[model samples]
Target: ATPASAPDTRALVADFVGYKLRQKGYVCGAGPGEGPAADPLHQAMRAAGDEFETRFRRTFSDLAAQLHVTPGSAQQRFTQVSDELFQGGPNWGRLVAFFVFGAALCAESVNKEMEVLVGQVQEWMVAYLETRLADWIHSSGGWAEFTALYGDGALEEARRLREGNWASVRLEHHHHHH
Candidate 1:
């Protein structure tokens, strides 16, 4: 999390950029319905879109009107709320999955030297872990031992944060606006 009074505008832009890129880059981009929902990022993207529109309206009402929407309107608020929730999963998950998929695709298309380089990256991801189960193979104790000490579904939660869904998603329901 960013500090409350930090001078970095980068954090604000980073989340926006991350959310937007995922929304645009993935196949089943975020949205309400299934056709567009195949891309898990779709819902997250939709949320971001909503946030953008809402913020636009609140901060730049004239511009929002030019886009045919009024400030502080329902659509704007709706988008903000959806975006806040989407940050929990669809937004982050899609971004990470896409990034890995892109790297893999790039590695496949590249020459041997590049492939070797990419292999190093893949290796690093495996080597670095905050916990025993992060990326390593199952241990002798297995999932139960990890959960017994950590809590039920600890592995699943870690996977969700580390490799499964929403690996980079943050700011689940909170946003700061001025």
Candidate 2:
């Protein structure tokens, strides 16, 4: 049997998160010395950011197609019509409603697909914490109070893997590093 690999999907999601969702707008992907207009590498990275949603949507559609999961006619039509209207009008109100509707459904689909791999979970909660928790803690009035809750979880995890008799956990972490 062939070995299972999720690297492609994981890399795409990592690129999405690293490139757009969590990037600092001030720093160029290439470097800081070059002006935005003059830097070819920075331009490519910015263009990639603009195209992330389109690529993400395509990846979702590809998975759906592979799974033989076709959207119902009404939903598909609504999506296409909304997309066309947004492109033609660039109307904020219509665009907002369209995006909210589409985004909710898209999020639900992603959760369902992820459940097949990791069980039912609010992945967004973890994603949000990983992506923004540091920033939130840095400036919040109750700085030390909030992070006090998780102060030792990392060390506890480290102990479990490094010396504790958790071979599976150790192996899993080891593989990720490799």
In order of appearance, the predictions have TM-scores of 0.21, 0.23
Summarize candidate 1's per-residue lDDT along 97-155 as a digit string, tens digits: 33333332333433334555444443443343223324222442222332232323323
For candidate 1, the clash count comes to 9
What's the number of clashes in each of the models? 9, 0
Candidate 2 structure lDDT: 0.37
lDDT of 2 by residue, 1-178 (tens): 7556445433543343345422445433565554544224334433323333332345345434642454434334435444444443322233223333343344444445533422122244245334544354345422233233223333334323211221121243345553
The C-alpha local distance difference test score for the whole of candidate 1 amounts to 0.36
Clashing pairs in 1: 28-39, 29-42, 30-41, 30-42, 30-43, 31-42, 31-43, 50-79, 93-166
Give residue 62's lDDT in candidate 2 (0 to 100). Answer: 46
